[PDB]
């Protein structure tokens, strides 16, 4: 309902975790689980490549269609670009239904 493709076997969940690294333990044995760990975090890159199949348009509509377009006249900033502060932003929601089709 929120939109999209419903899949019985969707892309799998990808779980990740930093392995706990004990800080020095006591010198004489104790049953209790360790609760003192070295403070750490991780970082790295991640890549996702997806192949999409397109269904080309085959319309005999004579007149031009509606199309998503960038604004023409001057503006303080560029839509879908960064700030003077380096902040990226999406000015508006962009749908998918521009071309038309008969029923």
Look up residue 9 and give its DSSP letter.
S
Closest contact distance (angstroms) between CB of 94 and other proteins is 16
- Choose from other proteins, Na ion, none: what does 67 bind? Cβ within 5-8 Å by kind: other proteins
How near is the Cβ of 50 to other proteins at its closest, in Å?
Answer: 22
Does residue 79 touch Na ion according to CB under 5 A? yes
Contacts for 8-13: CB closer than 8 Å, 24+ residues apart: none
Taking the CA atoms of residue 81, residue 86, residue 89 and residue 91 in that order, the dihedral angle to the nearest 10 degrees is -60
Residue 77 or 100 with smaller CB distance to other proteins: 100
76 binds, among other proteins, Na ion, none (CB under 5 to 8 A by kind): none
The closest alpha carbon to 61, from 26, 88, 21, 101, belongs to 101
């Amino acid at each position: 309902l929120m939109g999209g493709f419903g899949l019985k076997h969707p892309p799998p969940q990808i779980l990740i975790k930093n392995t706990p690294v004990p800080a020095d333990p006591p010198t004489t044995f104790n049953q209790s689980k360790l609760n003192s760990f070295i403070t750490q975090y991780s970082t790295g890159q991640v890549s996702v490549e997806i192949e999409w199949e397109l269904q080309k348009e085959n319309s005999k509509r004579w007149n031009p269609e509606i199309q998503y377009t960038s604004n023409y006249y001057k503006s303080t900033s560029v839509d879908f670009a960064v700030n003077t502060e380096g902040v990226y932003s999406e000015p508006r929601p962009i749908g998918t239904r521009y071309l038309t089709r008969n029923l």
